Amino acid sequence: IPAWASGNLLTQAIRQQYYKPIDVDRMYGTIDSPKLEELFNKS
Amino acid sequence: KFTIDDFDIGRPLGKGKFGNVYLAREKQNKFIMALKVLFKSQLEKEGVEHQLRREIEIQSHLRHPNILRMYNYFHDRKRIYLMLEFAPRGELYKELQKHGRFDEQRSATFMEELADALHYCHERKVIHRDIKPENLLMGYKGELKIADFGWSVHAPSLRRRTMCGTLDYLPPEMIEGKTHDEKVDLWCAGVLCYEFLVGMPPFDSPSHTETHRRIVNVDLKFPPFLSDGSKDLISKLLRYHPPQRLPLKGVMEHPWVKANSRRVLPPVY
Numbered sequence: 500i501p502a503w504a505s506g507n508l509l510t511q512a513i514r515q516q517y518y519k520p521i522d523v524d525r526m527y528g529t530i531d532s533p534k535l536e537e538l539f540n541k542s
Numbered sequence: 543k544f545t546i547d548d549f550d551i552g553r554p555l556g557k558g559k560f561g562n563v564y565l566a567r568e569k570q571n572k573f574i575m576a577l578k579v580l581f582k583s584q585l586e587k588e589g590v591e592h593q594l595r596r597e598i599e600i601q602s603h604l605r606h607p608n609i610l611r612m613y614n615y616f617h618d619r620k621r622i623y624l625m626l627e628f629a630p631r632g633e634l635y636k637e638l639q640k641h642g643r644f645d646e647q648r649s650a651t652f653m654e655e656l657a658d659a660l661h662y663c664h665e666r667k668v669i670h671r672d673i674k675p676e677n678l679l680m681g682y683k684g685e686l687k688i689a690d691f692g693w694s695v696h697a698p699s700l701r702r703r704t705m706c707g708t709l710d711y712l713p714p715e716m717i718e719g720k721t722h723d724e725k726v727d728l729w730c731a732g733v734l735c736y737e738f739l740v741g742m743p744p745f746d747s748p749s750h751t752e753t754h755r756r757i758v759n760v761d762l763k764f765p766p767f768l769s770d771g772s773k774d775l776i777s778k779l780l781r782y783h784p785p786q787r788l789p790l791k792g793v794m795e796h797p798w799v800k801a802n803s804r805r806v807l808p809p810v811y
């Protein structure tokens with residue numbers, strides 16, 4: 500288990516994320532998705 | 543588009559019979575999330591491809607502070623990956639089991655959050671159909687997060703026929719083989735409120751037939767420790783006739799909810 504995912508470092512990161520939310524709508528929501536019909540086809 | 547190499551894998555969060563969920567950090571923005579990993583071959587062999595497709599379609603289009611967000615998804619040669627909001631306080635059912643029952647403050651807060659999330663769903667003609675503690679996770683400040691949409695349906699026009707959900711939570715209309723609508727979620731909210739406060743569902747019985755009997759008779763027997771306010775709300779949700787059930791707006795406005803809820807909305811970007 501990497502350091503970032505365990506003790507205080509995780510707690511602090513989670514707190515930081517709660518109080519400083521990123522624009523997930525543009526950072527992930529604008530990024531292309533595979534078509535749902537493609538999900539079980541070639542990657 | 544995303545690939546698995548865009549994420550630092552931290553640790554497993556949970557195990558399923560189709561894949562696993564991991565705590566992950568996407569490298570670009572150092573943003574901590576959960577990755578649900580499903581195996582394409584297992585999904586096909588079990589014949590659940592269209593089932594998973596529906597769950598993804600529904601959840602990926604919902605944006606609410608009390609609904610677990612699906613940020614995006616991707617696939618590779620063998621696996622489908624769902625990028626999910628991480629719920630730092632974990633399973634609600636584990637918390638209920640640890641405490642036995644929740645106090646009025648905790649329960650009322652959860653009920654406000656639930657009613658708000660379900661209202662959002664119903665506004666979009668999505669019916670959840672499986673509200674129970676096991677389908678709920680908890681945010682950083684303990685906020686309810688609807689996490690699973692396994693029995694959910696987008697039902698724009700037709701009433702529904704599918705018996706689904708969980709024994710102790712089934713509404714009378716499902717047991718009786720009637721058509722159902724979004725008001726099934728109202729019933730389940732009532733069962734949930736009771737279980738929160740009591741630690742057992744209201745129609746608990748040793749047999750499926752006796753549980754069914756108790757549900758259709760609405761054989762509700764309140765423990766003496768419950769407040770009048772909580773019994774009022776539960777009673778108004780657990781109505782035999784779907785049209786008589788307290789609307790979700792009614793739950794949010796209920797005096798017991800107003801007096802006891804300590805709901806906090808998460809900061810937004």
Ligand SMILES: c1nc2c(NC3CCCCC3)nc(Nc3ccc(N4CCOCC4)cc3)nc2[nH]1
Pocket residue numbers: 555556557558563576610626627628629630631632633679689
């Ligand atoms: C998407 N999927 C998530 C989780 N997965 C659960 C586990 C797999 C099936 C049910 C959902 N857990 C989440 N949160 C957890 C936070 C702490 C957890 N722990 C339990 C106690 O020990 C520390 C870690 C477990 C789950 N978040 C999440 N987002």
